[PDB]
Amino acid sequence: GSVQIVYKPVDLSKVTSKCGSLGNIHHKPGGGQVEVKSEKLDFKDRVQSKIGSLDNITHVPGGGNKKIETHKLTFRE
Amino acid sequence: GSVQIVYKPVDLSKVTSKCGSLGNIHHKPGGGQVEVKSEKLDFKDRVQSKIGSLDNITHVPGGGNKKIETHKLTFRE
Amino acid sequence: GSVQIVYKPVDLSKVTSKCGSLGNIHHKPGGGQVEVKSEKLDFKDRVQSKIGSLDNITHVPGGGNKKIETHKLTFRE
Amino acid sequence: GSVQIVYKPVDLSKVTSKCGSLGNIHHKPGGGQVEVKSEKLDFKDRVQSKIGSLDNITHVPGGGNKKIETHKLTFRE
Amino acid sequence: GSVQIVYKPVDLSKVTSKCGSLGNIHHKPGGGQVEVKSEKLDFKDRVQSKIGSLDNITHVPGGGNKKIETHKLTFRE
Amino acid sequence: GSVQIVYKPVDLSKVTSKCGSLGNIHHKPGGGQVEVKSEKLDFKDRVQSKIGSLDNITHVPGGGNKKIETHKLTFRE
Amino acid sequence: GSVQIVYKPVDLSKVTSKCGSLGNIHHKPGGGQVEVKSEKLDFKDRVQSKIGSLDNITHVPGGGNKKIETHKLTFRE
Amino acid sequence: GSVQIVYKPVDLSKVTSKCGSLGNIHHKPGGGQVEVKSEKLDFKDRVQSKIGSLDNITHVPGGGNKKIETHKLTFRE
Amino acid sequence: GSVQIVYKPVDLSKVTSKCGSLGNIHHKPGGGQVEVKSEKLDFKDRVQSKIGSLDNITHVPGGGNKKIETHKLTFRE
Amino acid sequence: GSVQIVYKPVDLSKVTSKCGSLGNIHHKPGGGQVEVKSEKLDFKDRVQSKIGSLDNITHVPGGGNKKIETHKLTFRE
């Protein structure tokens, strides 16, 4: 028996944006306090931990448009 | 038996942006305090830890458009 | 049995941006305090740790457009 | 049995940006304090540690467009 | 059995940028203090450590466009 | 007519204290934010104003005993 | 007419304190933010103003005992 | 008429303190931010102003005992 | 008429202190930021102003005992 | 009429202190930032101004005992 696989996806997707003006943004955090106590930490695989954190992010992209596109073809015999 | 695989994805995706002006951004954090106590740390695999952190990020891209596109073909016999 | 693999992805993706002006950005952090206590640290694999940190980042790209594109072909017999 | 692999990806991706002006950026950090205590550090593999840090980065590229493109072909018998 | 591998990727990717003007950048850090205590340090593999750091970076490229492109062909018998 | 004033107050007041131990005091404020708007301020006499304030006081006296003692004699003819 | 004033206050006041130990005091403020707007300030007499303030005081006296004692004699004819 | 004033205050006040030990004091402020806007300032008398302030005081006297004692005699004819 | 003034205050006040030990004091400020805007400043009398300040004081006297004693005699005819 | 003024204050005040040991003092400021804008400054009398300041004082006297004693006699005819 013959097996024929044709995988032909066609993509014409426009993920666009327009913005006439993008301004006047004031991010003014007022401090804070974080206290973390631990004794034993054992991270043994794909760990992405984040302990004892006080972060401030001002993220102003003029765009920021995202496009994630995954293609998987799994052939087994 | 014969096996034929044709993998022909076609991509014409435009991830664009426009911005007439992008300004007047004030990121003004007010300090803070982080205190972390530990004794034993054992990180043995793909670990991405982050301990005892006080960070400030002002990220202003004029674009910032992202496009992640993964292609996987797995053939097994 | 004969095996034929044809892997022909075609990509014409434009990840662009426009910005008329990109200015007037004030990142003014106000200090802070980080205190980390540890005794034993054992990092034995692909570890990306970051301990006791007080960072300030002003990242203003005129573009900042990213395009990650991975291609995998795994053939097994 | 004969095995034929044809791996012909075609890429015409433009990751571009335009910026009329890119200016007036003030990064003014206000100090801080980091205190880290440790006794035993044992880093034995691809470790990328960073301990006791107070950094300030002003990263203003006129572009900053990134393009990561990985190609893997694994043939096994 | 005969094995034929044809690996012909074609790349015409332009990672460009334009900038009419790129100026007026003021990076003015205000000091700080880092205190690190350790006793035993044992780094035995590809270690990239960085201990007790107070750094200031002003990175203003007129371009800054990056293009990482890896090609792997692994043939096993 | 003769006027005789005898003003003889006698004071033997002991304002004392004892404390066997005075310790283990943790004052840990968590920031905050104060915003004050004004236009016209006109303070013309014994004014003791305090505008736009974020204060933290840890006052631990081993004593702290106070003794205010006022004496007034007003003679008029 | 004769006027005789005798002003003889006698004071034997002990304002004392004892403390066996006075320790272990941790004052750890976590930042904050103060913003004050004004246009006209006119302070013309004994003014004790304080505008736009972020203060931290750790006042640990081993004593701290206060004794205010005022004496006034006003004779008028 | 004859006027006789006798002003004989007697003071034997001991404002003392004892402290067996006075230690282990940690004042650790975490930054902050003060922003003051003004246009016209007119201070014309005994003014004690203080504008735009971020202060940290660790005041540890082994004593700190205060004694204010004012004597006023006003004779008018 | 004859006027006789006798002003004989007697003072035997001991403002003392004892301290067995006075140590282990850690003043660790974490920076901060002060921004003051003004246009017109007109200080014309006994002015004690203080504008745009970021101060740190560690005041550890072994004593610190204060004694203010004012004597006023005002005779008018 | 005859006027007789006798002004005989007697002072035997001991403002003393004892300290067995006075040590282990760590003043560790972490920087900061002060920004002051002005245009017109007009100080015309006994002015004691202080503008744009970032000071650190470690004042450790073994004594520090103060004694202010003012005597005023005002005779008018």
- What is the DSSP track for I12-75? --------S-B--EEE-----EEEEE-SEEEE-SS----EEE--EEEE--S---EEEEEEEEEE
Distance (Å, whole) CA J32 – CA E30: 5
Contact indicator for E9, D72 with CB cutoff of 8 Å? no
Declared resolution, Å = 2.8
Beta strands D66-75 and E66-75: pairing type? parallel
Got the DSSP string for H22-66? B--EEE-----EEEEE-SEEEE-SS----EEE--EEEE--S---E
Distance (Å, whole) CA D15 – CA C16: 6
Please indicate whether, in this complex, the C-beta atoms of H27 and G2 are within 8 angstroms of each other.
no
D31: nearest Cα among H33, C36, E67, E7: H33
H15: nearest Cα among G61, D20, A40, I13: I13
Q: CB-CB: which of H33, H50, H74 is closest to I74?
A: H74
What count of Cα atoms within 13 Å lies in the side-chain half-sphere of residue J37? 10
Distance (Å, whole) CA F32 – CA G52: 14
Please indicate whether, in this complex, the C-beta atoms of C27 and D28 are within 8 angstroms of each other.
yes
Q: How far is B30 from chain H (nearest CA, A)?
A: 4
Tokens, residue H72: 């006023």
F4 contacts: CB under 8 Å, gap ≥ 6 = G4, G6
C55: nearest Cα among D34, G77, A4: D34
Tokens 């591998």 correspond to E5
Contact indicator for B48, A48 with CB cutoff of 8 Å? yes
Distance (Å, whole) CA I77 – CA A19: 84
Contact indicator for C10, B69 with CB cutoff of 8 Å? no
Tokens 């690996």 correspond to E7
J30: nearest Cα among A13, D35, H20: D35
Distance (Å, whole) CA D64 – CA J69: 70
In the 8-state DSSP scheme, what is residue J69? E
Q: How far is B26 from chain A (nearest CA, A)?
A: 5
Please indicate whether, in this complex, the C-beta atoms of B52 and C49 are within 8 angstroms of each other.
no
Cβ count within 10 A of residue F40: 10
Contact indicator for H17, I18 with CB cutoff of 8 Å? yes
Q: Environment class of residue A63 by beta-carbon count within 10 Å: exposed (0-12), middle (13-18) or buried (19+)? A: buried
C-alpha distance from residue J72 to each of F76, H52, I71 (Å): 23, 38, 6
Contact B20/G at CB under 8 A: no
Got the DSSP string for G52-75? EE--EEEE--S---EEEEEEEEEE
Tokens, residue B22: 């992008």
State which amino acid sits at residue I6: V
F69: nearest Cα among H14, I13, G70: G70
C-alpha distance from residue C58 to each of B20, E26, E58, J58 (Å): 21, 11, 10, 35
Contact A61/C at CB under 8 A: yes
Q: How far apart are the first and last CA of chain J?
A: 12
The angle at the Cα of F57, spanning F51 to F60, to the nearest 5 degrees, equals 150
Distance (Å, whole) CA A21 – CA D60: 21
What count of Cα atoms within 13 Å lies in the side-chain half-sphere of residue D3? 14
Contact indicator for H70, I76 with CB cutoff of 8 Å? no
A30: nearest Cα among G29, G30, F37: G30
Please indicate whether, in this complex, the C-beta atoms of D32 and J33 are within 8 angstroms of each other.
no
State which amino acid sits at residue F8: K
Largest Cα separation within chain C, whole Å, is 70
Please indicate whether, in this complex, the C-beta atoms of F62 and H19 are within 8 angstroms of each other.
yes
Q: How far is D55 from chain E (nearest CA, A)?
A: 5
Closest-CA residue in chain D for J54?
Answer: D30
The angle at the Cα of G45, spanning G39 to G47, to the nearest 5 degrees, equals 65
In the sheet that B51-53 helps form, which strands lie side by side, from edge to edge?
A51-53, B51-53, C51-53, D51-53, E51-53
Continuous H helices in chain E: none
A61: nearest Cα among A22, A27, A29: A22
